[PDB]
Design an enzyme around this catalytic site. Structure first.
Site, PDB file in Angstrom:
ATOM      1  N   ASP A   8       0.870  -1.163   0.000  1.00  0.00           N
ATOM      2  CA  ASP A   8       0.000   0.000   0.000  1.00  0.00           C
ATOM      3  C   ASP A   8       0.909   1.217   0.000  1.00  0.00           C
ATOM      4  O   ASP A   8       1.826   1.304   0.821  1.00  0.00           O
ATOM      5  CB  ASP A   8      -0.906  -0.008   1.235  1.00  0.00           C
ATOM      6  CG  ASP A   8      -1.924   1.134   1.258  1.00  0.00           C
ATOM      7  OD1 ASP A   8      -1.920   2.034   0.393  1.00  0.00           O
ATOM      8  OD2 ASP A   8      -2.756   1.128   2.187  1.00  0.00           O
ATOM      9  N   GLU A 716      -1.187  -1.081  -4.478  1.00  0.00           N
ATOM     10  CA  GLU A 716      -2.315  -0.179  -4.313  1.00  0.00           C
ATOM     11  C   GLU A 716      -1.794   1.229  -4.078  1.00  0.00           C
ATOM     12  O   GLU A 716      -0.907   1.432  -3.245  1.00  0.00           O
ATOM     13  CB  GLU A 716      -3.189  -0.614  -3.149  1.00  0.00           C
ATOM     14  CG  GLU A 716      -4.255   0.375  -2.770  1.00  0.00           C
ATOM     15  CD  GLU A 716      -5.126   0.725  -3.944  1.00  0.00           C
ATOM     16  OE1 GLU A 716      -4.979   1.833  -4.495  1.00  0.00           O
ATOM     17  OE2 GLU A 716      -5.954  -0.122  -4.321  1.00  0.00           O
ATOM     18  N   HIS A 780     -31.657   0.013  -5.219  1.00  0.00           N
ATOM     19  CA  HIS A 780     -30.659   0.257  -6.249  1.00  0.00           C
ATOM     20  C   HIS A 780     -31.195  -0.131  -7.622  1.00  0.00           C
ATOM     21  O   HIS A 780     -31.992  -1.063  -7.763  1.00  0.00           O
ATOM     22  CB  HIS A 780     -29.378  -0.519  -5.948  1.00  0.00           C
ATOM     23  N   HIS A 921      -2.128   0.687   8.066  1.00  0.00           N
ATOM     24  CA  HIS A 921      -1.347   0.655   6.833  1.00  0.00           C
ATOM     25  C   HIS A 921      -0.890  -0.761   6.513  1.00  0.00           C
ATOM     26  O   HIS A 921      -1.073  -1.252   5.390  1.00  0.00           O
ATOM     27  CB  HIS A 921      -0.144   1.580   6.958  1.00  0.00           C
ATOM     28  CG  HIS A 921      -0.505   3.020   7.100  1.00  0.00           C
ATOM     29  ND1 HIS A 921      -1.443   3.630   6.301  1.00  0.00           N
ATOM     30  CD2 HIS A 921      -0.051   3.971   7.947  1.00  0.00           C
ATOM     31  CE1 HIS A 921      -1.553   4.900   6.649  1.00  0.00           C
ATOM     32  NE2 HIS A 921      -0.719   5.132   7.645  1.00  0.00           N
ATOM     33  N   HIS A1219     -19.684  12.521  32.450  1.00  0.00           N
ATOM     34  CA  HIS A1219     -20.514  12.300  31.275  1.00  0.00           C
ATOM     35  C   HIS A1219     -20.977  10.856  31.118  1.00  0.00           C
ATOM     36  O   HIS A1219     -21.317  10.461  29.996  1.00  0.00           O
ATOM     37  CB  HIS A1219     -19.765  12.731  30.019  1.00  0.00           C
ATOM     38  CG  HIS A1219     -19.742  14.208  29.811  1.00  0.00           C
ATOM     39  ND1 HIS A1219     -19.319  15.088  30.783  1.00  0.00           N
ATOM     40  CD2 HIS A1219     -20.094  14.963  28.747  1.00  0.00           C
ATOM     41  CE1 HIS A1219     -19.408  16.323  30.323  1.00  0.00           C
ATOM     42  NE2 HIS A1219     -19.876  16.275  29.088  1.00  0.00           N
ATOM     43  N   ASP A1250     -17.179  18.311  26.532  1.00  0.00           N
ATOM     44  CA  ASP A1250     -17.280  19.707  26.926  1.00  0.00           C
ATOM     45  C   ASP A1250     -15.928  20.338  27.209  1.00  0.00           C
ATOM     46  O   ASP A1250     -15.630  21.420  26.698  1.00  0.00           O
ATOM     47  CB  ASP A1250     -18.176  19.838  28.161  1.00  0.00           C
ATOM     48  CG  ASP A1250     -18.668  21.250  28.372  1.00  0.00           C
ATOM     49  OD1 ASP A1250     -18.536  22.068  27.440  1.00  0.00           O
ATOM     50  OD2 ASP A1250     -19.190  21.541  29.468  1.00  0.00           O
TER      51      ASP A1250
END
EC number: 3.1.-.-
Length: 1288
Positions: A8, A716, A780, A921, A1219, A1250
């Site tokens: 890649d 790729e 589709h 990766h 939270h 926040d």
RNA sequence: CGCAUAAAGAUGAGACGCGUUUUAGAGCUAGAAAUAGCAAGUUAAAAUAAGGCUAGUCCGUUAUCAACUUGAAAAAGUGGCACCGAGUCGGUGCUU
DNA sequence: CTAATCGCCAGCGTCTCATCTTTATGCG
DNA sequence: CTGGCGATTAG
């Protein structure tokens, strides 16, 4: 023991993986060197490599041009100084010396403080008589008294040092706007017998003094006396004052295009041609002058000769008047705000405007509400709206001043003081030549041979002053080398330049390539010469059937430039001669090359005995463009000749390659390095860095596997509301009244599908009822080719919409959509992609060629860089040859496209999260490898589609239903709600080979994707660039300031700060301890700046000696660049960032259940599948919502191990306990933002729900001196460990 | 395979306008001072990566770069294999 | 009486000319 | 954006 390599390639990363035939990445133990005690490391053969991005070379180009301009400006000042030198010594001898050392402090001066006059009283008298330099310039222009010579030098030096632009050619005298605008209508009435209504009051230039570039100028021309054509209303005003575009085709009543232009180079020749083939032009030029000096000159020109100085004096006086008026008004009204405006330099008041760092806009924005609060300040607000309140003289918009104004002021100054000094009379044109000289853009840098960028050739050999410039430099050869050093050579013969596009040999070649193998019965033999003589060389455009049938009945890709050279030379005698052919081949090169019309005049005065002056001017006014593709020695330099073979029905490329006579010499003439091979590629350097690293890691991986070549290498290369408004405008119905036309908050397709399809189904004319989110779903138009476009779906109410397994639309849909929906696609309500996809079922359905187009649209990649890197790898990997001299393909380069592997992620739930760690990766490289080798095992012959026999896929449709990768799914679905089972163990077409045992291969892919240890390497670099920050700081008593010159001490003059460290060195030595000069030993890490990098690489020992060290060990100097890796206790890793700052080195390996749960919880409202699948996913995430506490415990243990950032850790834990009572979908975004605390690289500052957490930076390198330094290879498999505790 | 249009990017050359830094533009009155009140302000000179030698109206921020052994550089050369497992890699066996 | 930590900070607008590649978009 | 630096706090 075969294997395969997957790669890649990104712009900041290269991922590599090595797989065997069972899709299992192998492992191996490696030897380590150094002085430590470890001797064998077990490692896996999968990893990535990270580096900084590449940079383009534009910033270096801009700074190089700035350096050249500063050197040339200093040389202009030096020229004027030496032309005033030998006579200034009568008046004042050390005047230029005082003018040179004016920068430095009084204790370092060698003369008086006051530079211009040498004492106090004359200095104060001069500055009281003249406040600025513009008062002095206006006095020197207007008054007729013998001034002092120093004042004349000061005025001329200020006029030479800043000298305006060069964007307007021709002379320019300062002439009003409307006072000459009626004179144009006067010439229009006295020259054109018509009714030009002199609209005295239309104010064309006066309303054109505002923002009237094109639109307002054309509107003011329209709101005037109406013209019958646009060439009279807009075009004549364009050719007079504005941006000109006239034409002598349907406006000047000419039989040829004699198009004039604005003030340019070709305008004088075009005016001479328009006057010599057929005043008002002088009035148009004066109107252009008035429109040009409209906005800049704001004063009458009757009372004086220098308008610029009068404008600046007027600006000075109005600044003084408004200053004292504002002072009196603020003294009256608000006496408590006096000090904030007139004394506070930190605020944006007047004192900040003069002495602080405030610009004009911040000062205006600061003073506007205070001026609005008071009263009696009406005209001040009038000036502030017009941007003319308290204006300086050297502003940021003096860039519109042309150089002719300064030239006129200098000419008047030299004319007025002429008879008082004789050497001013002798040297007027020298000083004017100093001011107006400018090196032409094709001569380039005046060099002698030591330049990477020069191309200039000299005639003589001496210094080049601006007076003997034309005597020294050859201009024609320089203008030729300026072009020929850029145009590429031909690919066949790599040393020869390329013909122009309109060459006669190239025209003969293209007409013979057209009509040699032409058949329509095949053409004749020797009659082709008469055919090209009559039909081709007589007609300006050869017809397709008409003229060919006419020539065939009479006997029994055009040469337009030949006809242009025929009618320009007005004959047909020399246009077919022998030597005149190559003569004209030189003339067309001359006409293509230059664009200056005088070097052209010399190069055609070389050929004066072929025409008179009239033909000479008629051909000299011509021009051409374009360069071809071929050579001259290719066509007529190899002997028969290639033109001789093409004249008398083989193809040109068939003559080149297929014939053994021609293909030998070109293949012999085809007979660089790697870096030179990548250097002349295309694209950004950001990809070229990754390409070079890819070649290096491939060679290293071939080396590590015991010198065996691989089998496959897989590559790729990774990488609206206006439509609703147009639909509402084309519809006319209630498109915005009830259902609002506002695609601002609408992000999902639930509103865009109703907006694109006008609130109804594509097949059914029913009410969609868009208020329900549990309403009609999406279907589709062609399912499994995978597609998720806007014109690849449909929204019917509730049906199967047809009965079929390979066709979505029905015949009733095609019958009802023929008028309304097809007109809506014709009115751009729906796109053209949906119209053809909805109507293609009425043309026989899904044909075999459409299936071929679908598989070639799903498989073939189109980008050129992938083809070039595949070519580089194939040429570097496959090199053997057989007895027939053919390539022995031992490896196969297979290129993919990222859509396939992305579908493989989103199909079998191998989800990817970019924010966790850098393992993705290597995982993308591994998935690319396994998908590529499976696809090349399953469909063999389709290697001809991508691996770089035709085997065209028209009689192959292996693949049956829709897609290429439809065999990976263990249970394929259908179109109209059905199922279709699949066998377990796949096999090849003819050969017997199991490729895709489902359970074993999926268990192997899970086991590889959950592997904890991969190889992540950050590439070590030596930093280059600027020396420091570019700002200049005022003087302090610090010691970090760097001097701007050699003998300017920074405690008196200021300087730069924050230098950039190139690399570091580890020094062990002894330094002075205490006042007794004790030699206490010390092991220290010191940073080397770039200037010190040069001075230290010259000689290390004396540099470290003079720095303050004594008795060093010369063999123990260890260089450490950026991103050097240090290992500490408990596996803590630190990367060196500078001499005094570290970066995080470790990496977090989360299990696969957690990253799958994170991907499911993140896109909880964006599932985008089947409703049963979305319901099952929602039940899967809501069935257990206590993974996130385990993830919190995971990063808590990790950050307690290697991060050591306990304050921010406790802040995070307190934020989480606050939270806790929150929905899950709002909690996944916070828990995915949380991962940059433990990430790899520089410490960043993130944000929770926040609160906001700052960054814990690592500003201490005292521990690193007792660590283990790692020296890694390019893949990280070969290491060298150094124990720094045992060193010294 | 070839033409026409448009956009984007790369590379190179020639020019503008600012900005920044020190100095020069005599600050005045009252107190021993600390200070206060008052007046003023728009411009210029020089440098604009330290510098370098091949001394040109040149060149100095792009690209390239783990360690060790050779080589002046260029460049070349240097590291055993199977199996069972997995918290940044571990363990067992064969042969060196 | 030296080391950690906090908070701020970082050269920028334009114009003229030339040569290539690549992508999209028609037309054969 | 990520390292430098002065003012400030902490050991």
């Amino acid at each position: 023991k075969k294997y395969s390599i997957g790669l890649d390639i990104g712009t900041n990363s290269v991922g590599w993986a090595v797989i065997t035939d069972e899709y299992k990445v192998p492992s191996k133990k490696f030897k380590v060197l150094g002085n430590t005690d470890r001797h064998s490391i077990k490692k896996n053969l999968i990893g990535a490599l990270l580096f900084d991005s590449g940079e383009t070379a534009e910033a270096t180009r801009l700074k190089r041009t700035a350096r050249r301009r500063y050197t040339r400006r200093k040389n202009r000042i030096c020229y004027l100084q030496e032309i005033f030198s030998n006579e200034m010594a009568k008046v004042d001898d050390s005047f230029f010396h005082r003018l040179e050392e004016s920068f430095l402090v009084e204790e370092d001066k060698k003369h008086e403080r006051h530079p211009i006059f040498g004492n106090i009283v004359d200095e104060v008298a001069y500055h009281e008589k003249y406040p600025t330099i513009y008062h002095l310039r206006k006095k020197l222009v207007d008054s007729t008294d013998k001034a002092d010579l120093r004042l004349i030098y000061l005025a001329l030096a200020h006029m030479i040092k800043f000298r305006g632009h060069f964007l307007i050619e021709g002379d320019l005298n300062p002439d009003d706007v409307d006072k000459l605008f009626i004179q144009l209508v006067q010439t229009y009435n006295q020259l054109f017998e018509e009714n030009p209504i002199n609209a005295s009051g239309v104010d064309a230039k006066a309303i054109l003094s505002a923002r009237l570039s094109k639109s307002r100028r054309l509107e003011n021309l329209i709101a005037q006396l109406p013209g019958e054509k646009k060439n009279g209303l807009f075009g004549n005003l364009i050719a007079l004052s504005l941006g000109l575009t006239p034409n002598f085709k349907s406006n000047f009543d000419l039989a040829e295009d004699a198009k004039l232009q604005l003030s340019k180079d070709t305008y004088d020749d075009d005016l001479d041609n328009l006057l010599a083939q057929i005043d008002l032009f002088l009035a148009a030029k004066n109107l252009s002058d008035a429109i040009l000096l409209s906005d800049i000159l704001r004063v009458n020109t009757e009372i004086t000769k220098a308008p610029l100085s009068a404008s600046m004096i007027k600006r000075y006086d109005e600044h003084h008047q408004d200053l004292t008026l504002l002072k009196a008004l603020v003294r009256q009204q608000l006496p408590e705000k006096y000090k904030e405006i007139f004394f506070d330099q930190s605020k944006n008041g007047y004192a900040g405007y003069i002495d602080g760092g405030a610009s004009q806009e911040e000062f205006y924005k600061f003073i506007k509400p205070i001026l609005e609060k008071m009263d009696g300040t009406e005209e001040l607000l009038v000036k502030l709206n017009r941007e003319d309140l308290l204006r300086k003289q050297r502003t940021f918009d003096n860039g519109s001043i042309p150089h002719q104004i300064h030239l006129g002021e200098l000419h008047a100054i030299l004319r007025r003081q002429e008879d008082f000094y004789p050497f001013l009379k002798d040297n007027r044109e020298k000083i004017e030549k100093i001011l107006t000289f400018r090196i032409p853009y094709y001569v380039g840098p005046l060099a002698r041979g030591n330049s990477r960028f020069a191309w200039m050739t000299r005639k003589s050999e001496e210094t080049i002053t601006p007076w003997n410039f034309e005597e020294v430099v050859d201009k024609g050869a320089s203008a030729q080398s300026f072009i020929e050093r850029m145009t590429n050579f031909d690919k066949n013969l790599p040393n020869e330049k390329v013909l122009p596009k309109h060459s006669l040999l190239y025209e003969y070649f293209t007409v013979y390539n057209e009509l040699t193998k032409v058949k329509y019965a095949f053409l004749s033999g020797e009659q082709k010469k008469a055919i090209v003589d009559l039909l081709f060389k007589t007609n300006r455009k050869v017809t397709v059937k008409q003229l060919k049938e006419d020539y065939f009945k009479k006997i029994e890709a055009s040469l337009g430039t030949y006809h242009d050279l025929l009618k320009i030379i007005k004959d047909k005698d020399f246009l077919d001669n022998e030597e005149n052919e190559d003569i004209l081949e030189d003339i067309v090169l001359t006409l293509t090359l230059f664009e200056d019309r005088e070097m052209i005049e010399e190069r055609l005065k070389t050929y004066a005995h072929l025409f008179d002056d009239k033909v000479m001017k008629q051909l000299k006014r011509r021009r051409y463009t374009g360069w071809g593709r071929l050579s001259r020695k290719l066509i007529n330099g190899i002997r028969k000749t290639i033109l001789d073979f093409l004249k008398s029905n083989r193809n040109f490329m068939q003559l080149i390659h297929d014939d053994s006579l021609t293909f030998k010499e070109d293949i012999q003439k085809a007979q660089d390095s790697l870096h030179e091979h990548i250097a002349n590629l295309a694209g950004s350097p950001a990809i070229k860095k990754g390409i070079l690293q890819t070649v290096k890691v491939v060679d290293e991986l071939v080396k590590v596997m015991g010198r065996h070549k691989p089998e496959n290498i897989v590559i790729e290369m990774a990488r609206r509301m206006k439509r609703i408004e147009e639909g509402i405008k084309e519809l006319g119905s209630q498109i915005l009244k009830e259902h609002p036309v506002e695609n601002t908050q609408l992000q999902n397709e639930k509103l865009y599908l109703y907006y694109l399809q006008n609130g109804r189904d594509m097949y059914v004319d029913q009410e969609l009822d868009i208020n329900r989110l549990s309403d009609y779903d999406v279907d589709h138009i062609v399912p499994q080719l995978k597609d998720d476009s806007i014109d690849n779906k449909v929204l019917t109410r509730s049906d199967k919409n047809r009965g079929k397994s390979d066709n979505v639309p029905s015949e009733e849909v095609v019958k009802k959509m023929k008028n309304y929906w097809r007109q809506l696609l014709n009115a751009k309500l729906i796109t053209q992609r949906k119209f053809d996809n909805l109507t293609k079922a009425e043309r026989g359905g899904l044909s075999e060629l459409d299936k071929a187009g679908f598989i070639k649209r799903q498989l073939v990649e189109t980008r050129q860089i992938t083809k070039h890197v595949a070519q580089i790898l194939d040429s570097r990997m496959n090199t053997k040859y057989d007895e027939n001299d053919k390539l022995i393909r031992e490896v196969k380069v297979i290129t993919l496209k990222s859509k396939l592997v992305s579908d493989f992620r989103k199909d079998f739930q191998f989800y990817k999260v970019r924010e966790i760690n850098n393992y993705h990766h290597a995982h993308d490289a591994y998935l690319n490898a396994v998908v590529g080798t499976a696809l090349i095992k399953k469909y063999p012959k389709l290697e001809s589609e991508f691996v770089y026999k035709v085997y065209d896929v028209r009689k192959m449709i292996y693949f049956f239903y829709s897609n290429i990768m439809n065999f990976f799914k263990t249970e394929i679905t259908l179109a109209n709600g059905e199922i279709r089972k699949r066998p377990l163990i796949e096999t090849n077409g003819e050969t017997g080979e199991i490729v895709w045992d489902k359970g074993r291969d999926f268990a192997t892919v899970r086991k590889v994707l959950s592997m904890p240890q991969v190889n992540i390497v950050k590439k070590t670099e030596v930093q280059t660039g600027g020396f420091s920050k570019e700002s200049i700081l005022p003087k302090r008593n610090s010691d970090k300031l760097i001097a701007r010159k050699k003998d300017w001490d920074p405690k008196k003059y200021g300087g730069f700060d924050s230098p950039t460290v190139a690399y570091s060195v580890l020094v062990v030595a002894k330094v002075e301890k205490g006042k007794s000069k004790k030699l206490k030993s010390v092991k220290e890490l010191l940073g080397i700046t770039i200037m010190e990098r040069s001075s230290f690489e010259k000689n290390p020992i004396d540099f470290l000696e003079a720095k303050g060290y004594k008795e060093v060990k010369k063999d123990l100097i260890i260089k450490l660049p950026k991103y050097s890796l240090f290992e500490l206790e408990n596996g803590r890793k630190r990367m060196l960032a500078s001499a005094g700052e570290l970066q995080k080195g470790n990496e977090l390996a989360l299990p696969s259940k957690y990253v799958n749960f994170l991907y499911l919880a993140s896109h909880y409202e964006k599932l985008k599948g089947s409703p049963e699948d979305n319901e099952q996913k929602q039940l899967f995430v809501e069935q257990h919502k206590h993974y996130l506490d385990e993830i919190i415990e995971q990063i808590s243990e990790f950050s307690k191990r290697v991060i050591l950032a306990d304050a921010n850790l406790d802040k995070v834990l307190s934020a989480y306990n606050k939270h806790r009572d929150k929905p899950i979908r709002e909690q996944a975004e916070n828990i995915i933002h949380l991962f940059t605390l433990t990430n790899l690289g520089a410490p960043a500052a993130f944000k929770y729900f926040d609160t906001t957490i700052d960054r814990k930076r690592y500003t201490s390198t005292k521990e690193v001196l007792d660590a283990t330094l790692i020296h890694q290879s390019i893949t990280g498999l070969y290491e060298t460990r150094i124990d720094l505790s045992q060193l010294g």
